[PDB]
Amino acid sequence: AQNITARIGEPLVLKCKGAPKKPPQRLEWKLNTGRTEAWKVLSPQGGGPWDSVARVLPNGSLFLPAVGIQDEGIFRCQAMNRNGKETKSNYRVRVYQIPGKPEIVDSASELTAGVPNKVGTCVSEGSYPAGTLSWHLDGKPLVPNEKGVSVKEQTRRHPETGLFTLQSELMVTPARGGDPRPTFSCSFSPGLPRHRALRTAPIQPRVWEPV
DSSP states (O other): EEEEEEEEEEEEEOOOTTOOOSSOOOOEEEEEESOOSSOOOESSSSTTTTTTOOEEEETTTTSSSSGGGGGGGGEEEEEETTTTTTEEEEHHHHEEEOOOOOESSSSSEETTTTEEEEEEEEEEEESSSSSEEEETTEEOOOTTTTTTBBEEEEEOOOTTTEEEEEEEEEOOOOOOTTTTTOOEEEEESSSSSOOOOOEOOOOOOOEOOOO
């Protein structure tokens, strides 16, 4: 199977290899996605509730007006070139969605060296697939469980759109004598490299010293 990646809401056309360019054609599409209860067979004539979802074109290609999460899966076409030449087509479809620009909430105006502090919470909404959030300190990435650095992550899927909302709360134990004016930032990285990482506006808290 060849891997195909389409953006949610965008149209998708799957070619039927070895199919006659004009009707009538001897072919059948069989797909297994989130819409199909099992294997759904689509004929050149079609006819049903699938016509507004997935339709076979006059040239034999499968057409989806607007792909969705429900349309992820396997698409296979078995065509018959006149005779008895037969050609198979195998497609693996994955979809994606870019979230809005990540925002930092509950950010600390100031913080104290030597003790755990709540730096802030990064929030990303409307992404598929889920993806990951990652914090950065002055350009370099921060890693959990190392030197008082910890995160409190959670992922939540919207009941209707099926899109994901990410939340990452950063906590750091600043080194005494360290940088009094550190720069923090959160970045969103998608599952597949379909686009570049999305980074928050930086937060620049003050580091005060304990009495």
